[PDB]
Ligand binder design. Structure first.
Ligand SMILES: Nc1ncnc2c1ncn2[C@@H]1O[C@H](COP(=O)(O)OP(=O)(O)O)[C@@H](O)[C@H]1O
Ligand SMILES: [Mg+2]
Lengths: 300, 394
């Protein structure tokens, strides 16, 4: 796996199992499954008031306030229809599937239920895609607190959409390797003839973050994507949203696989040094031939 | 041999090894493991040229263990199997060993202290009814050790294959309320080494593999001196790894185990024994004696038994005793510690001290008739003849 995926496996598995149990005609059993995801997201699939016939899937996010703004539920409503209900106490979004009113083709609703977090993110993000498509300059620009110490500053103009990631890693080894993994991020635009303008900075914050509360500091890195109307059109904005959504998690993932990569080269060099040491052991004059197990040969 | 031509044999009958000979001798005439084996077939071993009788005993039953199922007739000093013990004794007094006519011989036997009395009673019964010996005596092991060393005072720490016991004696008067008996010895150390080796991927699960692990513990293992320093050596360096070639041909590697298996004498909690080590038990035994005998008990600590032959056991015992004395007598005064005088007498031939003491005692008392339990006294009284020794049984 190189690119992180956007659909959660536990949601899909649990809902598909419940829908298979309901479609076969078996009586429904209880369900109470709580789990998490990337960026501190918390999922909870349960039943409302012990009602074993309804399954409610709730999600608690970190961009709590940006999703409550007016117009931040157009995509969620459009995709989820009647499944979207009032949030469960303590959570932020909540779907409600009735196991007796499930439409046919139960694969589509489960495929769209595993992408609940991606859809909550794309709903608060397509606002600026539309602010740019409709040909209006100076539309609202905000800061999505998609994590707790990192921010994503989104701005929409007449001809572009600027996304500035203010990012910082927790561990010291991760910080030291992330400096490299972020310095070398402008060398990617040589792999495709059409890639958004990427700018990296850790000396000083960009001039977009001087009127806003996006996280700044001397340990934070700033990565600016400039998505043009060839990356934010009504046909290639799904991939763009997926990538802008999973960028930080993908960088973290590959920072943590770089170590398991380096370990193999270190083992190789360790063996190469052992081979240089081996020149010190005087070769024996006669060895006793043994067996696969290691016992005496028992024969000539 | 006495003035009647009746040979005076001395037989130690240890849990892990029989040491037999004659009175006045300077070395045991025969030292052989006390195990009885029966022939079995195994799918991994193939032998077709050495004649294996239906019952091998002692030395041949240990050297030919690859084709036998062996079992010890003794355990913890208590005879668990009486038929196997009778076979071992038949072999001991047989032609391919001490060759004696048991009808016209006296014998000197031993027994650990604080042992069930039915054991000694049945041993005497067997010696008088089966072999029909003309005289039997059952001496105390610490008394024999002090006979062999040539002392009259000292605290014998006798740690055999089957059992460890600490017995102090002062001026020839036995203090039986201070006799301590800890049940950790060579065999439990061997089992702990088997466990540790199983942690490394080697499996010694058969009756014969126990002797292999025993011969490993005897060659490689040693008692640590400063256990923190030994653990630092085992965890930081690689100078403790040593290879051993099993009989079949496999090569095993033993590392830190070398000082972890025999440590279960000083730290019993490693093998799930709730008590104190041999050093702390020795110190408590001493500090339980009257004030006027402690200072002489500290100067005559006599080691005995095979299990005290680990490289560096005397020095570690002395260091442990000095630390205990500094913390619990001088209460932390380092200045006075230099005045504390221990002397852990570890003679070079300390593996057969009990037999040498038995030889001395028998050479002294062979020609008396109030020392031995005579067969006539047995035929007249029964198991009451043991009252001659000072052990009152009815
Ligand atoms: N050099 C040694 N180092 C450590 N342990 C030993 C050594 N020699 C013997 N042993 C252990 O002690 C036992 C022999 O001690 P011994 O006094 O003969 O026992 P017993 O009580 O049977 O007479 C063996 O079974 C062995 O496990
Ligand atoms: Mg003994």
């Amino acid at each position: 796996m190189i690119l992180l995926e956007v659909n959660n496996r536990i949601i899909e598995e649990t809902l598909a199992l419940k829908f298979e149990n309901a479609a076969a005609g078996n009586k429904p059993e209880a369900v109470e499954v709580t789990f998490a995801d990337f960026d501190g997201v918390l999922y909870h699939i349960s039943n409302p008031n012990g009602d074993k016939t309804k399954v409610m899937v709730s999600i608690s996010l970190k961009f709590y306030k940006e999703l409550q703004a007016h117009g931040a539920d157009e995509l969620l409503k459009r995709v989820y229809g009647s499944f979207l209900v009032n949030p469960e106490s303590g959570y932020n979004v909540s779907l409600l599937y009735d196991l007796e009113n499930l439409p046919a083709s139960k694969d589509s609703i489960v495929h769209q239920a595993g992408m609940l977090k991606r859809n909550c993110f794309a709903s608060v993000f397509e606002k600026y895609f539309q602010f740019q498509e409709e040909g209006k300059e100076g539309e609202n620009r905000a800061v999505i607190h998609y994590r707790d110490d990192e921010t994503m500053y989104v701005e929409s103009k007449k001809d572009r959409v600027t996304v500035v990631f203010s990012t910082v890693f927790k561990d010291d080894d991760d910080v030291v390797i992330g400096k490299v993994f972020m310095q070398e991020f402008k060398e990617g635009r040589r792999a495709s003839h059409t890639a958004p303008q990427v700018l990296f900075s850790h000396r000083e914050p960009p001039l977009e973050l001087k009127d806003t509360d996006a996280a700044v500091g001397d340990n934070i890195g700033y990565i600016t994507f400039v998505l043009f109307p060839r990356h934010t059109n009504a046909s290639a904005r799904d991939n763009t949203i997926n990538l802008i959504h999973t960028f930080r998690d993908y960088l973290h993932y590959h920072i943590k696989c770089s170590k398991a990569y380096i370990h193999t080269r270190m083992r190789a060099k360790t063996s190469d040094f052992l081979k240089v040491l081996n020149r010190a052991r005087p070769d024996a004059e006669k060895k006793e031939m043994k067996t696969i197990t290691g016992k005496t040969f028992s024969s000539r | 041999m006495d003035s009647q031509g009746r040979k005076v044999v001395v037989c130690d009958n240890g849990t892990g090894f029989v040491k037999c000979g004659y009175a006045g001798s300077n070395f045991p005439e025969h030292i052989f493991p006390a195990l009885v084996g029966r022939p079995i077939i195994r799918s991994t071993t193939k032998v077709g040229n050495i004649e294996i009788k239906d019952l091998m005993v002692g030395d041949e039953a240990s050297e030919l263990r690859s084709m036998l199922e062996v079992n010890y007739p003794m355990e913890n000093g208590i005879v668990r199997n009486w038929d196997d013990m009778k076979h071992l004794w038949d072999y001991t007094f047989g032609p391919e060993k001490l060759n004696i006519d048991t009808r016209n011989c006296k014998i000197l036997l031993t027994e650990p202290p604080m042992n069930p009395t039915k054991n000694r009673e049945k041993i005497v019964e067997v010696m008088f009814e089966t072999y029909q010996f003309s005289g039997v005596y059952v001496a105390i092991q610490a008394v024999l050790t002090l006979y062999a060393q040539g002392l009259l005072t000292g605290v014998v720490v006798d740690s055999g294959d089957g059992v460890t016991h600490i017995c102090p004696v002062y001026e020839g008067f036995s203090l039986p309320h201070l006799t301590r008996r800890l049940d950790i010895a060579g065999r439990d150390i061997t089992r702990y080494l088997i466990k540790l080796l199983l942690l490394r991927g080697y499996a010694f699960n058969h009756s014969a593999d126990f002797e292999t692990v025993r011969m490993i513990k005897e060659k490689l293992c040693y008692v640590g001196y400063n256990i923190e320093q030994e653990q630092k050596l085992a965890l930081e360096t690689t100078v403790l790894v040593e290879s051993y070639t099993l009989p079949d041909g496999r090569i095993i590697k033993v590392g830190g185990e070398r000082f972890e298996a025999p440590e279960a004498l000083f730290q019993p909690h490693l093998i799930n024994v709730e008590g104190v080590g041999v050093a702390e038990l020795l110190f408590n035994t001493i500090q339980a004696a009257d004030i006027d005998t402690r200072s002489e008990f500290y100067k005559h600590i006599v080691l005995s038994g095979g299990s005290t032959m680990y490289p560096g056991l005397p020095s570690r015992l002395e260091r442990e005793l000095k630390q205990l004395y500094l913390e619990r007598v001088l209460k932390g005064d380092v200045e006075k510690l230099s005045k504390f005088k221990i002397r852990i007498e570890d003679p070079p031939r300390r593996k057969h001290m009990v037999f040498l003491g038995g030889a001395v005692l028998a050479d002294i008392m062979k020609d008396k008739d109030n020392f031995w339990m005579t067969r006539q006294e047995y035929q007249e009284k029964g198991v009451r003849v043991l009252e001659k020794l000072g052990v009152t049984v009815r």
